Design a protein around this ligand. Structure first.
Ligand SMILES: Nc1ccc(OCc2cn([C@@H]3CNC[C@H]3O)nn2)cc1
Ligand SMILES: Nc1ccc(OCc2cn([C@@H]3CNC[C@H]3O)nn2)cc1
Length: 330
């Protein structure tokens, strides 16, 4: 089997991407944030504290004839950015882009943190990291991809995120028309439950490529590109007037600037992020100071190849017995 679904930016800055997901019988379609940095499929629901719901579409398991409460199971997730959610668990039928899993654990939120409430466009998350990170207790549950894997034509999914435009998540096949050149595959460590890999270096604009190992995670659920402070300083030094602002929370730059590209290495291959992908717009409405899309990972503890990087590539998440990651230009 295969599936293919369009993923759409939630706003004009590509702050996140939503993909429609069918849950239950009859289907309830929710727009979920596909997140290769976490492993829980959780949704706003009929069980979510009413004051914590503000415009999201909810899943109501009592209206799904295929839903079954997973007796005694709860979940609770604390994301690296400080957001959180928790609740109860159902099993139900879940379909993405024509690919159907029966008995998928659908984690229903009883509580969500304010950042989730305040984002009316995101009805929940669909985790695509490794199932070892799933938070359901006392019986850990499998991700949608893990449940689908054996049925798929090939045990892979691909992320093709658009810049200020829709893109595609495919399951079970590689669309050879969706990229240029070849796909370069690179080793993955699953020891922390993430799609962790090692970039071979970087360049800023038309500058020389610096060969240096940069360990990090491929994370569709993180908006920005978070890299070591040395790398980030070298990038922003090429933007006149750019500075790290403690009050704003990172590098900002004059909105009048034209930004240089940023290149990262995948083996001997090179993925070029155009400068415009690094512009996240005014820090507050009407300001002429703009927020940068490349930021230091120093406060995070891990480097994160988030959407800013991934949207410059066609990315293969290869879930074979020994997982690997593939990157192609597009
Ligand atoms: N600035 C920053 C960014 C990332 C970070 O940690 C990783 C992380 C990623 N996410 C996703 C977005 N919110 C829920 C998740 O899907 N949450 N935490 C810590 C600080
Ligand atoms: N699943 C999926 C994702 C994205 C997609 O297409 C995006 C796109 C839009 N455009 C042009 C913009 N104005 C004239 C258009 O032709 N080109 N590509 C098609 C299917």
């Amino acid at each position: 089997s295969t599936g293919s679904a369009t993923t759409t930016p939630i706003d004009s800055l590509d702050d996140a991407y939503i993909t429609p997901v069918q849950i239950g019988t009859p289907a309830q379609t929710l727009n979920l944030d596909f997140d290769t940095g976490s492993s829980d499929l959780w949704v706003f629901s009929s069980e979510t504290t009413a004051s914590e719901v503000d415009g999201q579409t909810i899943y109501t398991p009592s209206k799904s004839t295929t839903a079954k409460l997973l007796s005694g199971a709860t979940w609770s997730i604390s994301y690296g950015d400080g957001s959180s959610s928790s609740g109860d668990v159902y099993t139900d039928t879940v379909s993405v882009g024509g690919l159907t899993v029966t008995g998928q654990a659908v984690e229903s939120a009883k509580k969500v943190s304010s950042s989730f409430t305040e984002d009316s466009t995101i009805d929940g998350l669909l985790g695509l990291a490794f199932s070892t990170l799933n938070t359901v207790s006392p019986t850990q549950q499998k991700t949608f991809f893990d449940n689908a894997k054996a049925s798929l034509d090939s045990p892979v999914f691909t992320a093709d995120l658009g810049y200020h435009a829709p893109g595609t998540y495919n399951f079970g096949f590689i669309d050879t028309t969706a990229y240029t050149g070849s796909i370069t595959y690179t080793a993955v460590s699953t020891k922390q439950g993430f799609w962790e890999w090692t970039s071979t270096g970087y360049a800023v604009g038309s500058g020389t490529f610096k060969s240096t190992s940069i360990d990090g995670i491929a994370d569709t659920g993180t908006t920005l590109l978070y890299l070591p402070a040395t790398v980030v300083s070298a990038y922003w030094a090429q933007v006149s007037g750019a500075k790290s602002s403690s009050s704003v929370g990172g590098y900002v730059f004059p909105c009048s600037a034209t930004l240089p590209s940023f290149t990262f290495g995948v083996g001997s291959a090179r993925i070029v992020i155009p400068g415009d992908y690094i512009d996240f717009g005014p820090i507050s409405t009407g300001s002429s100071s703009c927020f940068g899309g490349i930021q230091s990972s120093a406060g995070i503890g891990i480097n994160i190849f988030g959407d800013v990087a991934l949207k410059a590539a066609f990315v293969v998440f290869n879930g074979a017995t020994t997982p690997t990651l593939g990157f192609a230009s597009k």
